[PDB]
RNA sequence: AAGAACCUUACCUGGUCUUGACAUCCACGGAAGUUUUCAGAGAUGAGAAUGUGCCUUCGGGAACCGUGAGACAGGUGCUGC
RNA sequence: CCGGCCGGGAACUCAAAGGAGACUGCCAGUGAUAAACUGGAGGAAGGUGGGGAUGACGUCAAGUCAUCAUGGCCCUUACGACCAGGGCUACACACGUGCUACAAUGGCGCAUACAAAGAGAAGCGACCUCGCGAGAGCAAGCGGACCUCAUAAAGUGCGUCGUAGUCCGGAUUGGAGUCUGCAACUCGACUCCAUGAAGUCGGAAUCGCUAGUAAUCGUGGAUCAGAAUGCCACGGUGAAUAC
């Protein structure tokens, strides 16, 4: 079995990537589970904005990390070289795991 | 308090100074800047000039001083009184 | 913020890796449970006589641009000032302004 | 406030026997959002009271409550800059809540072995008219009788 | 203290990021400050050569730097040579192998960084400040912008007391988050001190 | 109704009356009653003399009232004539464990006269 | 068959599966009397089943998750109303006059920067 | 200050260096490096072995080390009026 | 082996993407054929639904030249640089902001129910063994909806305490420890045993809060080798009062 686990910061960018891999999957022999929404990670930082005093003045930022799980089952060698083939984008972390 | 499976603490230079002052037989006050070292039973009777950041105060080792550390007999803050 | 301080931090890192590799296998002989008396009393001092920095507890984690010691964030390696400026300029990817 | 006249909150009734009055009483008597402790005190004060009186629980609480009942209040207003206290006819919904507030203020004093035992002393002491909450009611009535020159 | 950074809040709503790569926590500070070194090094060499924004991709453990510049012919150099220079050094100053691509700017007086470059260079070469600000305003409005505001602050004549001046033309709605607002600040270090320029250009709504 | 130095109260429970001794707190009395075998929720009015003399030897197991005040007083005395840091803080009348001397420590330096 | 209702209240979420049967109530593989003990959820889960007096006629298998016990009581009340509403729809017009179908969101406020617990200021002092 | 035991640290005592702890350029020499000893509170001072790597104008080239001369470096020093 | 454990199932809670939905849209009345207001219906929600982000021209020649940058001065065997030790933690006192309390709506002992949000690889560190405990040994699992931190606490049930400075309070101090760290004396945190201070609801004065709010209870994170009663977040219970 091969599972694809891919993370990003943009959900608009991570949607098209998992769409491309599910389409290049089910073109040839991969009855996939599809993109599966694992919960997103929110990293909330809260910095002071003044160079000096005024502790009460702060700005709160956050990173959101989106997760999609494609779990290709019934794998063929065409699935593994068509996963060897494509090089999706920057900002996308893909891990194929046997 | 240090953990018991570490052993007590003494500096290399202070311990070798203590041993050479015992082997040499001489008993003048010697100086250290190492207030963090534990006193030891071979160091009884001799004078240790312990640094308090400004000076080197002479400490006379007693029977009662053995397990303690060297900084407790050199107060680093001088206070007499406000009024 | 005192070029001396940046020089001192980059001084402590380079000694820290080398003597870290040494004192890691020299440190475990002190307090495993059960080695002996003699290697404990030798090993305290042969951990001691190495210079003070080259220990990782004398790092400071200054800002990687301005060298500011206070207000550090480990995720960005910056002080809060340069985090906020580089976030407003859009250089930290995925760092929106949080509003919940 | 300065503008609004908004609709009232609607609480859930008394569980042991369905009343809004006892739910207001357990809400007044409570502390730091501890509803269960307060209703335990209220129930162990009212079932232990109905055997002191002889009637059932609710209407014994009602004529322990209506003996402490402020007909009028005082207020402070301004006409000449003089700023005196003038009496006012109270609405009964705030009259009832001020009655419950005075009963709890009575029960927080007069200390003995419980809060519920203190309440079961207080409401009987009010229901035969010899309490300190009846002293608060007759002091309010006296301060309005002295100020009846303004109406 | 007023007026949150416009690129900052429209990063949430409208604008895209200057940097586009994913990293976990052990790679994050290293990638961040190596990209800071890359931007700082390209800053001089092409700040003689009219750049607006450089953006960093990192695909497949390799850095990709695409420059937006107003004069691409001075950026590429002759026969490509200059940018291969850039390529050859960026794979030194970022580790991972490097490729540099360049877009053309079709609006040389509508990007706030380039307008700020013009105003700060004219301010440091001792033009009057009012002529530079008014010419930037009339030029952007004549090329076609739905609004501009220029903000110049400092001593402004050689002065004992610093002054602040600004000039808007058109509409420039900052509280509207769907507004496409290019915004950049710059500084001109002059003999009397540092003078700040801020330029908001409003190009329309999405 | 009387152990090594003093009288213990009689209407109170065993562990609560046992804490009236200097040197015996809660865990000491728990161990004393566990070694004696008496269940702790009895009173000294309930309990006879054989249990309290088996209690007498079991509280003689511990350093208690008179020689414990002797031990604490002598330990402070040894620190005070030793002349160390904690002894000198015991001598001036200040905190010895590194408390803030700037504002607080009215327990140690006493009620606020001037 | 098997009628279903989802109630949600104050970060708790109750799933109600009701069927025509006896009057007994079951929550998370316990009965109602041994799951809850206090005066809430002995009134609160009863009031929808008492305004339309159906305490005898239907079995109720309930799973709940999240929140505390009063939030769980409000969530099972909101689930019981919707699951009862899947039977007949004159029921909702009669039960709405006392509430019970208003979801009552009322979340916890977020703690604000500079304040202490989302409304409390930290003690202004002039000097 | 989103965190002073040393560090941080800017402060004081005492010991030390002054083209420097951090930069670039010239000239001279040495792989870089590692291990190890003494005296020292340490910074530092003199050693003792081991090491000689890559292109090759191969008396050179990168990188590292010290030496001397400056240009200068360095300043959490003052004025936020 | 009743633990969704397993065949399985895609209904449900849930996880995230995409839509819808709330507009004074409808109804009646008051209102200048108006804008609007009040009420009603339905509706999960009613009138900017709740909360946040969002801070106009300017003011205070406010703060910061010690984050940074920067003009002008000032220094260059020194106001620069390196080190060890000390100090920033002192204490006749005064003030601000908190935490713990003065108890019985409570204290202690036993059993027991229900969360959300996070952090984790020189890291988080199961299970078992060892110690009263802080902890150690052994050491699986995890770059994580998987494993770990991590038992939630108020609550509930049963007992005991009978209003005393007391089984309230838990400061102080003596002793014995554990862990991090080159090193715990100046000057860490914690654990145990002992001790058991003031305090019995607080003068003149003064502050916060309009609803899932105040009040109260616990949990988590950043900084961080170690070091929160602070700061930032998350939930549990949950009012009174608006003439």
UniProtKB/Swiss-Prot annotation, chain D:
It comes from Escherichia coli (strain K12). The strain K12 sequence is shown. The keyword Membrane does not apply. This is Small ribosomal subunit protein uS7. Belongs to the universal ribosomal protein uS7 family. GO terms for biological process: cytoplasmic translation; negative regulation of translation; ribosomal small subunit assembly; translation. One of the primary rRNA binding proteins, it binds directly to 16S rRNA where it nucleates assembly of the head domain of the 30S subunit. Is located at the subunit interface close to the decoding center, where it has been shown to contact mRNA. Has been shown to contact tRNA in both the P and E sites; it probably blocks exit of the E site tRNA. Protein S7 is also a translational repressor protein; it regulates the expression of the str operon members to different degrees by binding to its mRNA. Keywords: Ribonucleoprotein, Ribosomal protein, RNA-binding, rRNA-binding, tRNA-binding. GO terms for molecular function: mRNA binding; rRNA binding; structural constituent of ribosome; tRNA binding. The gene is rpsG. It comes from the Bacteria. The chain holds residues 2 to 152 of 179 of the full protein. The lineage of its organism: Bacteria, Pseudomonadati, Pseudomonadota, Gammaproteobacteria, Enterobacterales. Part of the 30S ribosomal subunit. Contacts proteins S9 and S11. Cross-links to IF3 and the P and E site tRNAs. Changing residue 35 to A/E: Defective in ribosome assembly. One of its GO terms (cellular component) is cytosolic small ribosomal subunit.
């Amino acid at each position: 079995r091969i599972r694809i686990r891919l993370k990003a910061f943009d959900h608009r960018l991570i949607d098209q990537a998992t769409a491309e891999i599910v389409e290049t999957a089910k073109r040839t022999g991969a009855q996939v589970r599809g993109p599966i929404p694992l919960p997103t990670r929110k990293e909330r930082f809260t910095v002071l904005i003044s160079p000096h005093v005024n502790k009460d003045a702060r700005d709160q930022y956050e990173i959101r990390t989106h997760l999609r799980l494609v779990d290709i089952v019934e794998p063929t060698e065409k699935t593994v070289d068509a996963l060897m083939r494509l090089d999706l984008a920057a900002g996308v972390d893909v891990q194929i795991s046997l | 308090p240090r953990s018991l499976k570490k052993g007590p603490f003494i500096d290399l230079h202070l311990l070798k100074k203590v041993e050479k002052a015992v082997e040499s037989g001489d008993k003048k006050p010697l100086r250290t800047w190492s207030r963090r070292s534990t006193i030891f039973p071979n160091m009884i009777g001799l004078t240790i000039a312990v640094h308090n950041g400004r000076q080197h105060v002479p400490v006379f080792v007693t029977d009662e001083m053995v397990g303690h550390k060297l900084g407790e007999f050199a107060p680093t803050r001088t206070y007499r009184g406000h009024a | 913020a005192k070029q001396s301080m940046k020089a001192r931090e980059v001084k402590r890192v380079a000694l820290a890796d080398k003597y870290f590799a040494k004192r890691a296998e020299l440190k475990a002989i002190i307090s495993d449970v059960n080695a002996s008396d003699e290697d404990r009393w030798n090993a305290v001092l042969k951990l001691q006589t190495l210079p003070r920095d080259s220990s990782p507890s004398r790092q400071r984690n200054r800002c990687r641009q301005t060298g500011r010691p206070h207000g550090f964030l480990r995720k960005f390696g910056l002080s809060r000032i340069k985090v906020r400026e580089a976030a407003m300029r859009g250089e930290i990817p995925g760092l929106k302004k949080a509003s919940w | 406030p300065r503008r609004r006249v908004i609709g009232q909150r609607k609480i859930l009734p008394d569980p042991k026997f369905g009343s809004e009055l006892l739910a207001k009483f357990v809400n007044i008597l409570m502390v730091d959002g501890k509803k269960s402790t307060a209703e335990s005190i209220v129930y162990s004060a009212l079932e232990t009271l109905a055997q002191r009186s002889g009637k059932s629980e609710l209407e014994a609480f009602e004529v322990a409550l209506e003996n402490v009942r402020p007909t009028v209040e005082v207020k402070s207003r301004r006409v000449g800059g003089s700023t005196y206290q003038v009496p006012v006819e109270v609405r009964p919904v705030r009259r009832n809540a001020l009655a419950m507030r005075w009963i709890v203020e009575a029960a927080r004093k007069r200390g003995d072995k419980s809060m519920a035992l203190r309440l079961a002393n207080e409401l009987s002491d009010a229901a035969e008219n010899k309490g300190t909450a009846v002293k608060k009611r007759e002091d309010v009535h006296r301060m309005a009788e002295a100020n009846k020159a303004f109406a | 203290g007023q007026k949150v950074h416009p690129n900052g809040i429209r990063l949430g709503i409208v604008k895209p990021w200057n940097s586009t790569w994913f990293a976990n926590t052990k790679e994050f500070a290293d990638n961040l400050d190596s990209d800071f070194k890359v931007r700082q090094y390209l800053t001089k060499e092409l700040a003689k050569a009219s750049v607006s924004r450089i953006v960093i991709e990192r695909p497949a453990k390799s850095i990709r730097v695409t420059i937006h510049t107003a004069r691409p012919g001075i950026v590429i150099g002759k026969k490509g040579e200059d940018v291969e220079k850039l390529r050859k050094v960026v794979a030194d100053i970022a580790g991972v192998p490097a490729q540099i691509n360049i877009a053309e700017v079709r609006k040389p007086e509508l990007d706030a960084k380039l307008v700020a470059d013009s105003i700060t260079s004219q301010l440091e070469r001792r033009v009057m400040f009012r002529r530079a600000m008014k010419r930037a305003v009339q030029n952007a409005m004549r090329l076609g912008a739905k609004g501009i505001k220029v903000e110049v602050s400092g001593r402004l004549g050689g002065a004992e007391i610093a002054r602040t001046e600004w000039y808007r033309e058109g509409r420039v709605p900052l509280h509207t988050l769907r507004a496409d607002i290019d915004y950049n600040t710059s500084e001109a270090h002059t003999t009397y001190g540092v003078i700040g320029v801020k330029v908001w250009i409003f190009k329309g709504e999405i | 109704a009387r152990i090594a130095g003093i009288n213990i109260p009689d209407h109170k429970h065993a562990v609560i009356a046992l804490t009236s001794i200097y040197g015996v707190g809660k865990t000491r009395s728990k161990a004393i009653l566990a070694a004696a075998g008496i269940a702790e929720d009895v009173k000294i009015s309930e309990l006879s003399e054989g249990q309290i003399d088996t209690l007498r030897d079991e509280v003689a197991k511990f350093v208690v009232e008179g020689d414990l005040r002797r031990e604490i007083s002598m330990s402070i005395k040894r620190l005070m004539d030793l002349g160390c840091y904690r002894g000198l803080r015991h001598r001036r009348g200040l905190p010895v464990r590194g408390q803030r001397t700037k504002t607080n420590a009215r327990t140690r330096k006493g009620p606020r006269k001037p | 068959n098997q009628y279903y209702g989802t109630g949600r209240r104050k970060s708790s979420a109750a799933r109600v599966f009701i069927k025509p049967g006896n009057g007994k109530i079951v929550i998370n593989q316990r009965s109602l009397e041994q799951y809850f003990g206090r005066e809430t959820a002995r009134m609160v889960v009863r009031q929808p089943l008492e305004l339309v007096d159906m305490v005898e006629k239907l079995d109720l298998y309930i799973t709940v998750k999240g929140g505390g016990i009063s939030g769980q009581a409000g969530a099972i009340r909101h689930g019981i109303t919707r699951a009862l509403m899947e039977y007949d729809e004159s029921l909702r017009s009669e039960l709405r006059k006392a509430g019970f179908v208003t979801r009552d969101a009322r979340q916890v406020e977020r703690k604000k920067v500079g304040l202490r617990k989302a409304r409390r200021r930290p003690q202004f002092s002039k000097r």
